[PDB]
Amino acid sequence: PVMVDEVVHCLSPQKGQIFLDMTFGSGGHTKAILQKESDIVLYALDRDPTAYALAEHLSELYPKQIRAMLGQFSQAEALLMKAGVQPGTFDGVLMDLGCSSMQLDTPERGFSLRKDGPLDMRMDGGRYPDMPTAADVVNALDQQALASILRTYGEEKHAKKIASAIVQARSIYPITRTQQLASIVAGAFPPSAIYTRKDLLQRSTHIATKTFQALRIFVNNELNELYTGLKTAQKFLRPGGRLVALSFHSLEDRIVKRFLLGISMTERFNLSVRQQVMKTSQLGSDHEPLMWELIHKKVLRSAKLRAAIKL
Numbered sequence: 001p002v003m004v005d006e007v008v009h010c011l012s013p014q015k016g017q018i019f020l021d022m023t024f025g026s027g028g029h030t031k032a033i034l035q036k037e038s039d040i041v042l043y044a045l046d047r048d049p050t051a052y053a054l055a056e057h058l059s060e061l062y063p064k065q066i067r068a069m070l071g072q073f074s075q076a077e078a079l080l081m082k083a084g085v086q087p088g089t090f091d092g093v094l095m096d097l098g099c100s101s102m103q104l105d106t107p108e109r110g111f112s113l114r115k116d117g118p119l120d121m122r123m124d125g126g127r128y129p130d131m132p133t134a135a136d137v138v139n140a141l142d143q144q145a146l147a148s149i150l151r152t153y154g155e156e157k158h159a160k161k162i163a164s165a166i167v168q169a170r171s172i173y174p175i176t177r178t179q180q181l182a183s184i185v186a187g188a189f190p191p192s193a194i195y196t197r198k199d200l201l202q203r204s205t206h207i208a209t210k211t212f213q214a215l216r217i218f219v220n221n222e223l224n225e226l227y228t229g230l231k232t233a234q235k236f237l238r239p240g241g242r243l244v245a246l247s248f249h250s251l252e253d254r255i256v257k258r259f260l261l262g263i264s265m266t267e268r269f270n271l272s273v274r275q276q277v278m279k280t281s282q283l284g285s286d287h288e289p290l291m292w293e294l295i296h297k298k299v300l301r302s303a304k305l306r307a308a309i310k311l
């Protein structure tokens with residue numbers, strides 16, 4: 001788990017306090033919080049069934065403390081209200097964004113470039129069987145739409161040629177597997193551009209990394225989810241409570257940053273139907289009183305920790 005010591009330090013859990021871990025994952029951070037101070041109450045949320053079941057298991061060892069919840073950031077306000085949690089309650093809220101170890105290390109879920117699997121990439125697992133997969137997306141969207149997703153969400157300078165390769169490839173055989181898609185991405189580049197470039201095979205610099213990241217953000221609606229989750233975090237924090245967020249990508253970091261600065265960002269309800277249908281989101285992009293005390297910004301890894309005290 002990322003920056004566990006710093007997370008627990010920034011949260012500073014004390015006796016009698018109440019916490020929300022919005023990204024329970026494998027439970028790494030929640031367990032570290034409990035080891036620091038066990039006389040707490042902690043709501044453990046995740047959109048992934050696999051993570052939620054680990055939170056339920058943990059609640060069997062810590063029945064006084066843990067309340068496990070299955071849901072998206074966008075569902076968290078409803079979940080908390082139905083659980084009786086009032087606004088202004090939490091001493092701390094944690095958001096460790098992105099993928100869990102379970103999502104990355106289970107080839108069948110289709111998140112990673114190491115091992116081949118179905119091009120699934122849905123964080124919700126089997127919860128929403130009609131939720132579009134990454135395979136659905138690359139097989140259905142026209143060339144301009146795919147290029148826009150890669151450019152906007154992946155910040156992929158080569159979005160057009162990669163999109164062109166995807167559309168050419170799918171006309172031969174549908175794109176259904178992660179390594180199949182990675183090979184298609186690499187195929188967009190002439191040999192002289194990539195020959196003997198071992199970095200383009202390395203874990204975090206793989207030639208298909210940005211493409212996979214763009215598809216993950218789109219498939220899981222991560223930018224709108226994040227903004228909604230941050231607003232919910234602020235509403236349910238009490239004054240003096242701490243928000244701690246870990247970002248790993250330029251767009252989500254910019255969203256957290258602007259949120260903590262009190263800068264307004266795009267609400268979908270303010271976009272015309274045409275805009276919501278035909279354009280990619282500008283959340284986190286360059287040209288899209290005091291509520292916080294900003295108490296930490298630290299980096300390791302793409303990791304960036306931002307912590308703030310609600311005023």
Ligand SMILES: C[S@@+](CC[C@H](N)C(=O)[O-])C[C@H]1O[C@@H](n2cnc3c(N)ncnc32)[C@H](O)[C@@H]1O
Nearest residue numbers: 001023025026027028029047072073099100225
């Ligand atoms: C980086 S892992 C968190 C790891 C965790 N802190 C630990 O120690 O194991 C991110 C988790 O947040 C969840 N997640 C990502 N976006 C979400 C969203 N919009 N709503 C609810 N859960 C989300 C993922 O399913 C994943 O389990």
